[PDB]
Symmetry: C4
Subunit: 164 residues, 4 copies
């Protein structure tokens, strides 16, 4: 992680300030300060990986998937004849903790921190689907966005979407 000298000075000063404000953790700060001041490249790389990225459009796709399930569930709940469509199929199961952790994390963030989609059933494992779901959701979105309405959907439309 490079990282101009001027930035190193700024960071160095921060670790000094953090030591002043929070001496309980001086060890932690002096260590980082040393890494930054001396330009220990290995440890600097390792710092660099504390920082992730989840692209805007990916964030939006996740939110849209949740919105799709909102549209599906409401639509289902207003069907005269729930044409033997199981509620589970119209319920957002979330993402796989093992392979889709970034995505799962974002859902949890959107719900627990931001406060969105709070009336969703989290399931038994806080939206951990336990199977990969990303590819499925993409295909569902495609069918959903292709419908002439997205909300108040017919049983037919619901089935096309959930079976994508």
């Amino acid at each position: 992680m490079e990282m101009t000298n001027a930035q190193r000075l700024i960071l160095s000063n921060q670790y000094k300030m953090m030591t002043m404000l929070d001496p309980a953790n001086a060890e932690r700060y002096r260590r980082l300060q040393t890494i930054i001041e001396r330009g220990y490249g290995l440890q600097m790389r390792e710092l660099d990986r504390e920082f992730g990225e989840l692209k805007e459009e990916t964030c939006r796709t996740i939110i849209d998937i949740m919105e799709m399930y909102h549209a599906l569930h409401v639509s289902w709940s207003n069907l005269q004849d729930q044409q033997s469509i199981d509620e589970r199929r119209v319920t957002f199961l979330g993402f796989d903790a093992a392979t889709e952790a970034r995505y799962l994390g974002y859902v949890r963030f959107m719900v627990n921190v931001e406060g969105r989609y709070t009336h969703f059933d989290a399931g038994t494992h806080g939206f951990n689907a336990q199977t990969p779901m990303w590819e499925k959701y993409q295909r569902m979105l495609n069918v959903w966005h292709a419908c002439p309405r997205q909300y108040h959907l017919s049983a037919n439309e619901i089935n096309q979407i959930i079976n994508a």
Copy 2:
């Protein structure tokens, strides 16, 4: 937002420090810290939108409009015969809150914070003209700057300016 990782580290450290200094708002800072650390692109873009821009020359134009009204009002008050020029026409009415908010904001900043043009009549709504004025003011400035003097204006000159 196009942050480098070094900048993300700096910001992250700030939110930690702000939590130390102001624990009442730990929630607010922990959230921003998460957004920055994890690189949640959607949330980062929304961070970017909090920062506006009002170009130097636009700032100066606004100040100049106010200065023009100063020149106009002073000129008028020193007219031997105020040739039926209503004071209202020689009074800075400000900007439209609905479509010219940035401009209105700057006027208020220049007056209330900076302390300039304190003796101006703010009107009943703190310089909310309630109609767009920007285009009018530009035409007035053109006539005003074209006068061979800008101050101690003749009634004739005053009329040309206010009728631009």
Copy 3:
């Protein structure tokens, strides 16, 4: 000022922290914060003006001029015969406050803060020569650096230098 939005966020956070640490000056910090957040271009430019530049080589030239006077004064005081050479001529008078302020400021910094050349006679006005001296000093340096020794100068050499 050409700030990126990330930098504006960093600065904004600093002004919030400075308000926490030093509430006596909340108004000053609050005002800067507004300027930065809203991107008020005029005020941002005026912010830029707070920051000067004095190039490395200019800094070094000033220090060297002082060192030259050290060499001159020691040389003079060690002379069996000071050939009617006035001590004043071998004394660093400093710089013109009115036209050479940057230079005068640096001398004062080097002496009062850094602690260098503290045995120099500051004169009655803290190294303010109150005539411009920069061009003279340049010519003196040229003669001085051209001398085969720079120290333990002969009366002859001293005269060539001070008369440059």
Copy 4:
């Protein structure tokens, strides 16, 4: 130092904050602040030298040298007949304090701060070899990495490595 003005403002604000937090050292900070604000180039360059660099791959090489000595020492201890093979030769002596200070410092950091290779014999001088070792270690690594096993080495292999 190649600081932008925005960075200078950030740094200047830090030194203000550090003075608030730690007034005992106001002098230290006021001085740096002056250097930064006024752009005193000489002193600004001297700041830069406070920051060092030790490339990632060099950091890794040092760690690998230590790991090599771990592999060597364990292998030797497990030897049923140490065709002895003085233990001294299979012990990491460190780096020369006088010419390999950057390296020596990194070892000390990895051991004392990070907590790695804590069972290593530090010798009488905390890994100061007092002779240059860098070139030797490189040749040893070359032989070591060329062995089909890196660990559980034969006495033969140990000798090839230590004699590289």
